[PDB]
Amino acid sequence: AGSLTQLLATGSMDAALTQNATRTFWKSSYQKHSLFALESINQPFTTQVQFGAESHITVNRQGDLLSWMYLKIVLPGLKVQNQADTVQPTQQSFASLDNDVAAQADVSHVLPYIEGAYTEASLNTKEQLIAEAKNSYEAAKYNAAPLPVAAQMQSTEMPDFDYAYWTEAIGFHLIKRAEFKVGGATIDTIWSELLFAMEELMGRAGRRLTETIGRTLRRPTELMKASRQEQILYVPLPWYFTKHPSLAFPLVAATYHNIQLWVQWAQLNSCIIKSRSNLVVLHAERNVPISDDHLRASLECTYVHLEAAERDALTANAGTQLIVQHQAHLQQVSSNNVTARLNFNFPVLEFYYFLRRKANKDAGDHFNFSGIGGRDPVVSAELLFNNTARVTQKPAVWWRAVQALQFHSSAPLTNIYSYSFSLSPEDPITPSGSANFSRLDSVELALTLQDDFGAAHDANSELFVFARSYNILKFTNGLAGL
Amino acid sequence: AGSLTQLLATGSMDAALTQNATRTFWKSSYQKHSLFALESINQPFTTQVQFGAESHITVNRQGDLLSWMYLKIVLPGLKVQNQADTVQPTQQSFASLDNDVAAQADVSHVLPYIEGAYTEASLNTKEQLIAEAKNSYEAAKYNAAPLPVAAQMQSTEMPDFDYAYWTEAIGFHLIKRAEFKVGGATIDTIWSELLFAMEELMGRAGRRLTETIGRTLRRPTELMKASRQEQILYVPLPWYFTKHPSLAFPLVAATYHNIQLWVQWAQLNSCIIKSRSNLVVLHAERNVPISDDHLRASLECTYVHLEAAERDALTANAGTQLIVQHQAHLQQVSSNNVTARLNFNFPVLEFYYFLRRKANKDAGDHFNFSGIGGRDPVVSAELLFNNTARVTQKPAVWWRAVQALQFHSSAPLTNIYSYSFSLSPEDPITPSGSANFSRLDSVELALTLQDDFGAAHDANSELFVFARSYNILKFTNGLAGL
Amino acid sequence: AGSLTQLLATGSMDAALTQNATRTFWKSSYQKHSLFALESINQPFTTQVQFGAESHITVNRQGDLLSWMYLKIVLPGLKVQNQADTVQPTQQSFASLDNDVAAQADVSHVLPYIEGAYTEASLNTKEQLIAEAKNSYEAAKYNAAPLPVAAQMQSTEMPDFDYAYWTEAIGFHLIKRAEFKVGGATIDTIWSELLFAMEELMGRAGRRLTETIGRTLRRPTELMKASRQEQILYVPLPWYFTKHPSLAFPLVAATYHNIQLWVQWAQLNSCIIKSRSNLVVLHAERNVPISDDHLRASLECTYVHLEAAERDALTANAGTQLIVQHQAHLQQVSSNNVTARLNFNFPVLEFYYFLRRKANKDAGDHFNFSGIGGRDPVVSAELLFNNTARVTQKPAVWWRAVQALQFHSSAPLTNIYSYSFSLSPEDPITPSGSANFSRLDSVELALTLQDDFGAAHDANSELFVFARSYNILKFTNGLAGL
Amino acid sequence: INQPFTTQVQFGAESHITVNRQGDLLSWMYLKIVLPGLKVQNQADTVQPTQQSFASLDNDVAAQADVSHVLPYIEGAYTEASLNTKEQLIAEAKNSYEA
Predict the structure, then answer these.
(1) In this complex, is the C-beta atom of B79 within 8 Å of any C-beta atom belonging to chain A?
(2) Which residue blocks in C26-75 are alpha helix, DSSP H?
């Protein structure tokens, strides 16, 4: 009686929701699709792959569309030997944990707050004086309550043996820059720092790229274990056509253009960290000093094979694809107040920004975007259009956590900040908002950074700003162009 | 030959799926949208913000729609001083870890199972006797196999120094109640306990509110670290209009109504936990005793600016929005059998329920919904409509884990139970089932709780029941009303 | 001036995106739906439930559709007693940690690399010699750099007391096979190993089945704690009709067919692990030796009640549902080169494969798909259609991590490999690609495994291959059939 | 006509029987129960002493509960009294309680 009465208890308001219902929950409807197949094919670079060099590949035409694209990287296992035991000790310098430049830079900021005879003190007494000076510095700069000295003395249990390892997220760090080219024109460009920021914000829970890029979430002991043997990494290249099947790049519609991936590789000296400064780093299998020619890479592409009728239709009329392109503003930081002039073009969906200390970069911690003592490097930021506040001054947590909560699949674990003009900037096919920067005379991101950011040992810290913008790729008569 | 043969190998069954295909995977189609912009604007309260008080804000009209809404809370850093060293030691009482009322309440239930001279025993001997009595209690009540005494002696390594900290998820706890008002009518009401339950069930992986609300997942050492300095929290207010862009509140259509947020704040005594009972809690920067006027809050609103044509269309005909409203049944618990009479109205989508021990509340652990010794407080529950079983007796795990698995984005880490009448209760725009409680003469939730729940030291434990219900908000001639 | 200028700054390209816009972000539209209700009902098996037996249930007709289906399993708490203290010590043998067959099998592979007097060595000296021999084995087989001996000596802190526990993910392990039958015909079959693989790949972040199936992520101390008391598990049965509301099984349309669930239960000897070989395992409450009749299970079904008009429409014309069926190829492995001949039928969406060592199975670690020493058991795999490479030789990481990244909600934590022909194999209602195996004369999965896989103590290791295939379920005149 | 259960019959379980159609009407219905004879043995003499707990007359919980209500009416040194003296004091306290 009650359940039937609920179906009868309808009024004029229910008519807007349920009158002439076009859907039922109790019967499945499905759509028929055209026939297609997927094939993954690995392809060698056209030029030699080496650390610090640029290499390119011309993408083969082994199907009708191009869908997924992965850079397959093979890194050798690492071993170490004392320089005294080596017949040829001359190698490039690597970052070493016995010379922690990041910890030395952090100590340099607290030196003015050390009370007593620091120079003559025992090692254990120096560690105590540094922890007390950190409390005095943080009280003076941040009105922070002092932490117990014992809580600041975190011994990272480092192993009592010699090692070397590939840096955190080495699969991204290796790709300093990649360019997707069609007919000799650059269609899009991605950077190591952008790839990491995109994975932090858009990386879905349970599908994080951890193993696929050599990322351990800053657990040095896991990087050491992984680096003792050969590593095979599959780094996704997040081009517009890899984001949705309807955006797959129509190879058949671009028949008269070569499709190329260009990759600028990281220098070998930046890719490795060692336990001690006096160690030589060896290729674990070959027992020779590690060299720039030990980098191996290939391109793994997923091709789509279409039925003849769909292939012929796509060849006759591929039309236009909405694309997202990436733009970069890279700036050196030498002061706590920084203004970035964002000379980006087109309808910008969103931008990302973050800072890297010089000391973190020099320590080989390339994706450590933290400030001094691991703090947030940004105090506040403001966004100006033509000297008018588009976003008034907001604290770092608003740009990092509130923007990520509103617009992104994930909140960043590092100090990555974002701002979206789009309601759904991760939707590759549905435009949901933008600001046209080609119609603004000035776009300025004004930053107030933490105290002493870009001073002394951190002179030439880096500001990264990346923007995502809409453009249109047009296919006509076997040619493709922006 | 094989791939072409697959495209030809079609029969009468494939016609239902692929005949006259209206979609292709090999060409992107996109829709054009109207022009809009988003602006985030921070606004002060119209009344003073203080602990234990009620404050309100009249929301400004700085755009055409209202989308996201965050309560921006600023909490001072905490320090502690001995009461003997303080010129004015008189402060409100705070929960203290040297007087663990929750642990004392748990010990009170096992006192009848202590064999031997408990009163005269050494401290280490008392801890052994309590762990043995816990085994005897759990064997007698639950037929549990005894745990090794050493496995029950979990020392939480508490630091050997003085501290105070803001309670777990302080950003939610501060909001005892918030009311969204339009034209003086309450459109919706949210509670601290509901906000926490909603984040447990609907909080997406990689987008949990942890930092934004001061939540550490019960790691006291992280709450201590965070509480030594100023904290800025961004607490999302999950109103119907914040859930989807098409539900954004049409400011232009409600021109003759004031829009107000009212917030009832938590008492300061409930917000802080200290290491010892004899400590005074100080504002870390000001070096004065912490007081009710040290709470600071503002409202951060995201406005939408529309193109004139869409703004004019929305002003002429905003029509009706489907809304979700929240209802609450709050009850004291003094017996292991509890019947809650759910006097909720309208088409209910779902309800949540959970229990809080008096001892957990008094210990300042406001979101600890566990039973005695951290067990599940519910043994079983039944749902009755007009004295007829709508859901027959089911064990706690069915209401907690099976209902969350079927209908929610996440399973709760705490003892939160749910039941959905909707197939998709997290979809804000598509009704997918409900029960109309305004047409039921009685709705009863019958609970069998764990033994001794609501007895002795837990007299006046709390039952929370929250329901989500459909209603319609109508916009007409510059006015808005339910 | 700028925001209005952006709305005016439109060209011929914007017309494809925004001309005649059929959607606005500033007004919600909702659809009305038909009236329905959900009811969860628990039902006993029609036959006795026992370990190692087959049991069936005839599903009741308590609503119009069948939606969710959970196997509710109740396992007793475990206790242990010395065999010498037991009046009837005769019980089935259980795996024991004092006889670690998996560790003994791993040691057997490194015996040829032990230098010195192993047989006469002290226990601590034998552990050192085994760790050194592991380095020599791994250097010889994999060109691995040696790990420090201290880093290989992981003591799992096992408790110094007697225990027994239910094996990891016992809720899946108990279900050796389940069959969904309609009118005496098997519509679909699921296996324990498939259920685990499906949860690894398709299990969403924050909705993993951990507690619901007794899974701890290989933390033996948590399995021990859980196994001391009665456990209630809710194992989801992932049939086609549980995946989407529009696929709910139409009970009213199948009126003349009995609906049955058949379950083949695991043997009791495989379900329990004990600290020592000389222990008897007891039912914790009853204080009797654990026996095959101590398994309890029931079926929890969610019924849908429809409004009379929708019920009558569905009875008159339920038509056809697209279904996914599961197929299995199970093979013994006795060599490092393995070819699996996949005699699967119909349009295959995707397949999963993985290996289990005999030693891992015999140790009771049923979902440990790792190789020797916890390594990846697959070096490479190739997929052939009619002796032509459909997927050329690819390394294990491509089949495990790249395929999961492209097509699945999660990456597997275990050595589960997949390959999809579908762009969205987790979409239950939208076909997005397949390969028709009923039109291929041969489908071969060729595997190169790690060295010594399937040799000596691992003779009769297992290869599992599972495929997901499309079929059609037809409803006509109160009957249902494939 | 006597008919077996369709499911196993066990203590603490649920069992069902589908009633046969051996005539035109069903009149009387009796549950025929067969219980084994009981014996007892000392737990010390038993090779497997682990059994469910049973109520025992040496631990009369009903008599102990009745004594608990009269404890406030016991005059004198109850704790130190001989068994026969405790029985007297309980009977006197019962009179005082009932008065």
Answers:
(1) yes
(2) none
